[PDB]
Every structure is written in structure tokens, then in C-alpha cells.
Ligand binder design. Structure first.
Ligand SMILES: *[C@@H]1O[C@H](CO)[C@@H](O[C@@H]2O[C@H](CO)[C@@H](O)[C@H](O)[C@H]2NC(C)=O)[C@H](O)[C@H]1NC(C)=O
Ligand SMILES: *[C@@H]1O[C@H](CO)[C@@H](O[C@@H]2O[C@H](CO)[C@@H](O)[C@H](O)[C@H]2NC(C)=O)[C@H](O)[C@H]1NC(C)=O
Ligand SMILES: [Cu+2]
Ligand SMILES: [Cu+2]
Ligand SMILES: [Cu+2]
Ligand SMILES: [Cu+2]
Ligand code: NA
Length: 499
């Protein structure tokens, strides 16, 4: 069952064996992935998070981010540790109480402390639309049509060297899959469909690192949503999905009753499908209970290309139709050396006092804010352009902005910008050497918003900056509850930190 919009959520340690290998984990709701949190557009969510963690090897503190929800007026509930809150300590709880006006689509939630989400704290978050403009395109849309793609590691995250090329041991589809080495025939996930029906498949990357080449043998996929943003219908036979992205696609159950492989090939780790790695099963009602015998093509003739996507609504692009045609045009210098990433010459290391608390305490320009050189102020009610030229090692890097979605004016692997009708989204691959992926948005949401690569190992190695949007209005826009004001004193006391 789905939970929410008002619910408790307990965070616990437990052993799990999703690929046949047992290891301890950090779990929401006792499962991997965690339960789906759901509601309708405009609802009040009150997710009271109970930190019941006791195993220090995966950190006993926690903090949860609601990925892609704008948090307008509730910046304190966004979740990134040391940006909008101090962590919740073990044996305590915290009510994330926020609203979702003007958003409907497919989201997710995850730990936003260190690399803790890799250790298991990740799950879907769906905001349904009772008047969805795409409703007539399918018959079924429920918890059974969510498809999660996850990387899974046998080594615990706090034992992964910082700045290393860290590689997974299994791909998990809906929580199950097989290990790349020492492969055992452990159970595969089954997605069941009825011949003739149409399904809104909500494809969610909960990855800590790899991108996946996702396809379904014999089937094609009609994209209708991108990171929460309704799209024009785009039919493809493969989707390359980067960490933290989401798509909804219509699956027409229009092939002969039978079993079909669902494939998710990561860019690192095990290549191919030997032994049923990187796989799940699409089963039609009435089919024999047996593995598929289907083949992938050698090449995919209609892969997703990001410039083919266009919004369903007339969203346009803010600003003027040329590079630098914005009120505040930025170009970030994104670099890697010696195990650490940097943005504009500064490697991110979380501050002792959360950025939001520094601003509420009176620090009111970005040079007064810590970490020094890691906070850029943005002016209010202004068009912002951010160019993100690629080349730093470890690519392709999926950059994500909190508090906002954005127009993708220039996409990976294509030098031509689009100032007319590009897709809007919240996490974007910045591509390869020589690319100049560029995003635009308008500043109508005061608060400190993290900008970072969503490969969690890269964030941990410093690939982040904070946009302090409309510092002067942050305090009046974001009144804080007493329980939020209590977090930093409790955390600092528990960890013997002075501030
Ligand atoms: C990516 O595009 C940005 C503009 O959005 C380019 O920025 C210009 O860079 C040159 C130096 O390289 C400066 O003289 C300009 O002031 C910048 N802003 C402009 C022209 O509007 C950036 O060079 C591009 N990067 C790549 C790798 O193509
Ligand atoms: C490279 O990106 C550009 C810009 O998004 C794409 O150009 C558009 O192509 C569409 C589809 O044919 C035309 O309707 C638009 O007028 C083009 N816009 C511009 C500004 O040129 C282009 O198709 C992409 N290249 C590839 C190979 O997909
Ligand atoms: Cu996220
Ligand atoms: Cu986010
Ligand atoms: Cu990265
Ligand atoms: Cu983040
Ligand atoms: Na415009």
C-alpha cells in the first residue's frame, strides 16, 4: 500500500539480501526501496520521520530530501544536511510539514546526509493529478506501475574511498536483481500486465551513480512526463536515464500473451545479461510462469534524445534567445583533481552551521556565508542562466537543482541551444568533453538551494555549490517551527560540537 500524505516513517537498520547477498542497510518503512509516499496535487504532506538508527557503520543521524518538490516557503523542510537543517539524531523524530502547490508527477525521497541513501534510504514519492491532462492516454496508474532502478553495493558506503570510481555489485529493478560476480539465481522482479490495457509506467532512477539503458523487449514506450513536467507524447524503444531522473511512459500491452525481458544496463559494473543480471520480467496475465526467451536488438532504432522532448504546456523559455541573455548569466567552472571535485575553484565541504540557520541569524551576503566560496547569491525575480560545461572526470554528471525545475536550453552531445520549446526538468546530464549544457529559471522561491552532481560519491567529494536565492527575503518567506530550531542544539550537543 501507499502511505501519506500524513504518515509516520521509521528509519531503521536491518539485514537485506536483494541479490542473494546479505548485508545490513538503512531502511525507510522496513523495505528496499522504501514505501511509496503519495498524495494529490496541492496536498499538505506531514511526514513524521522517526530516526531509529543504531548502527554507526552507516551513520546514526539522518535527514530526508523530497526530490523535486519546490518547498516554496518551507525551505527548512527540504532536507539537505548542513544546507537547510542539522541532521535528526537517533531516538528523535521530526515532522516534515509542507505543501505541493502547482506540482504533479513522479518524484522520490532519499537520505541527504553523506552517502547514506546508497545504504538503502530511498523510495518513490508520487503526486497524482485528479484532472491530469494525460489521463485519457492509459487505463492503469497505481503502486503496481512504479518501476525503480537502483544500484546496490556489497561494501557499506562509509567504507567507499572519497573521490574514487566506486562500482556497484547489482542492478535492482523494483528491489530485486542478480549480482554481477558470484551470480546466484535469486528472485527477479515481475511486472504484470493484462493484454489490451495501457499502463502509466512511472520510471524512477533511485541510483547513487550509474545511468541505465532501459528497454522492454518487444515493446516501445510513449513518454508523457519528464521529472514532474508533462511532455508531448514521444515514442521510443530505449531510455537512457541518469541518476535521480524520472519518466512516465505509456506501455501498451499489445504484444502476444507471454514473458518479456525488462532490461536496465548500467554504464559501469556488469555489462550484458548473463545469468539474468540487469533484468526483470514483464509477464502478461495468462502467461506461463517461466523466464522470458526474448532478445534485445543489436541497436535500438528510436532511443530517447533529450532535444526531442517538449513540454505539453506552453512553457517557453525565460530571458532572451542567446547565450548570456538573462538578468544573471553564470558559467560554472566544474573540475576534478586528486580525488576532489570543485565548482569555481572551491570543493564543497559541509559547514558546521546550516546555511539557512546562518541566514536566519543575520548573515546577509554570500561572502558572509560558510563555506566560504561555496555560496552564490541570486537576485530575486530575475532570469538566471547557468552554463555547466562538461570535462571533469567521472562523467557524464547528472546535475540537480533544489527548489526549482529549469528549461534545458542546451542538452548533451548537441551544440545547438533551444530558446523556443525545450523540456523543463530538475536533473540533467551535462554530457561530454566540449559540451555546454545550459539551464534557465526565474527566481521566485527565496532560500538556500543546493546545486550538485547527483552521483552521490561525487557530491561527497565536493561537487556542489549553494544558490542563496533572495537572501533578504529568506527569513520572512520561510517561518520555521520550533522543532526545526531545536535540531542544531540537539545535534551539536549529541556530537560535542561548539557553535
Ligand atoms: C558556454 O557558454 C557560455 C555562455 O553561456 C560561454 O561563456 C562565455 O565564455 C567566454 C570565455 O570562454 C567569456 O568571454 C564570456 O563572457 C562568457 N559569456 C557569454 C559569451 O555570454 C562559455 O565559454 C561556453 N563554454 C563552452 C565550453 O563552450
Ligand atoms: C540538436 O538540438 C537542436 C535544438 O534543440 C535540434 O533542433 C531542432 O530540431 C527540431 C526538430 O527537427 C526543429 O523543429 C527545431 O526548429 C530545431 N531548433 C533549432 C534551434 O535548431 C536538433 O534536432 C538537435 N539535433 C539532433 C540530431 O537531434
Ligand atoms: Cu535527489
Ligand atoms: Cu533535490
Ligand atoms: Cu558527477
Ligand atoms: Cu541535493
Ligand atoms: Na521566452
Amino acid at each position: 500500500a501507499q502511505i501519506g500524505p500524513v504518515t509516520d516513517l521509521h528509519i531503521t537498520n536491518a539485514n537485506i539480501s536483494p541479490d542473494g547477498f546479505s548485508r545490513p542497510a538503512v531502511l525507510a518503512g522496513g523495505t528496499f526501496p522504501g514505501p511509496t509516499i503519495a498524495g494529490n496535487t496541492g496536498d499538505n504532506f506531514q511526514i513524521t520521520v522517526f530516526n531509529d538508527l543504531t548502527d554507526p557503520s552507516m551513520l546514526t543521524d539522518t535527514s530526508i530530501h523530497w526530490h523535486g518538490l519546490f518547498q516554496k516557503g518551507t525551505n527548512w523542510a527540504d532536507g539537505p544536511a548542513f544546507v537547510t537543517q542539522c541532521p535528526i539524531i537517533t531516538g528523535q523524530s521530526f515532522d516534515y510539514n509542507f505543501n505541493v502547490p502547482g506540482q504533479a508527477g513522479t518524484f522520490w525521497y532519499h537520505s541527504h546526509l553523506s552517502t547514506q541513501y546508497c545504504d538503502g534510504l530511498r523510495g518513490p514519492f508520487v503526486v497524482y493529478d485528479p484532472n491530469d491532462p494525460n489521463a485519457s492516454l492509459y487505463d492503469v496508474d497505481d503502486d503496481t506501475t512504479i518501476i525503480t532502478l537502483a544500484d546496490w553495493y556489497h561494501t557499506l558506503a562509509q567504507q567507499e574511498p572519497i573521490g574514487a570510481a566506486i562500482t556497484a555489485d547489482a542492478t535492482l529493478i523494483n528491489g530485486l536483481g542478480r549480482s554481477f560476480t558470484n551470480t546466484t539465481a535469486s528472485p527477479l522482479s515481475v511486472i504484470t500486465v493484462q493484454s489490451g490495457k495501457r499502463y502509466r509506467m512511472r520510471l524512477v532512477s533511485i541510483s547513487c551513480d550509474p545511468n541505465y539503458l532501459f528497454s522492454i523487449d518487444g515493446h516501445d514506450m510513449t513518454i508523457i512526463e519528464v521529472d514532474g513536467v508533462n511532455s508531448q507524447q514521444l515514442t521510443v524503444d530505449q531510455i537512457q536515464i541518469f541518476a535521480a531522473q524520472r519518466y512516465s511512459f505509456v506501455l501498451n500491452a499489445n504484444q502476444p500473451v507471454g514473458n518479456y525481458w525488462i532490461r536496465a544496463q548500467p554504464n559501469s559494473g556488469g555489462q550484458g545479461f548473463d545469468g539474468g543480471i540487469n533484468s526483470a520480467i514483464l509477464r502478461y496475465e495468462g502467461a506461463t510462469v517461466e523466464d522470458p526467451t526474448t532478445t534485445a536488438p543489436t541497436t535500438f532504432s528510436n532511443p530517447l534524445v533529450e532535444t526531442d522532448l517538449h513540454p505539453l504546456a506552453d512553457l517557453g523559455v525565460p530571458g532572451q534567445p542567446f547565450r548570456g541573455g538573462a538578468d544573471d548569466p553564470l558559467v560554472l567552472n566544474l573540475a576534478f583533481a586528486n580525488g576532489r571535485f570543485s565548482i569555481d575553484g572551491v570543493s564543497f565541504v559541509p559547514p558546521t552551521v546550516p546555511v539557512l540557520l546562518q541566514i536566519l541569524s543575520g548573515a546577509q551576503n554570500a561572502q558572509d556565508l560558510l563555506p566560504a566560496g561555496s555560496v552564490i547569491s541570486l537576485p530575486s525575480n530575475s532570469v538566471i542562466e547557468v552554463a555547466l560545461p562538461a570535462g571533469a572526470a567521472g562523467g557524464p554528471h547528472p546535475f540537480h537543482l533544489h527548489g526549482h525545475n529549469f528549461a534545458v536550453v542546451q542538452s548533451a552531445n548537441n551544440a545547438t541551444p533551444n530558446y523556443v520549446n525545450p523540456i523543463w526538468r530538475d536533473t540533467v546530464s551535462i554530457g561530454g568533453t566540449g559540451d555546454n549544457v545550459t539551464i534557465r529559471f526565474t527566481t521566485n522561491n527565496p532560500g538556500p538551494w543546493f546545486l550538485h552532481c547527483h552521483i552521490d560519491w561525487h557530491l561527497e567529494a565536493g561537487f556542489a555549490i549553494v544558490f542563496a536565492e533572495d537572501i533578504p527575503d529568506t527569513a520572512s518567506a520561510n517561518p520555521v517551527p520550533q522543532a526545526w530550531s531545536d535540531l542544531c542544539p540537539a545535534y551539536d550537543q549529541a556530537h560535542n560540537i561548539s557553535t
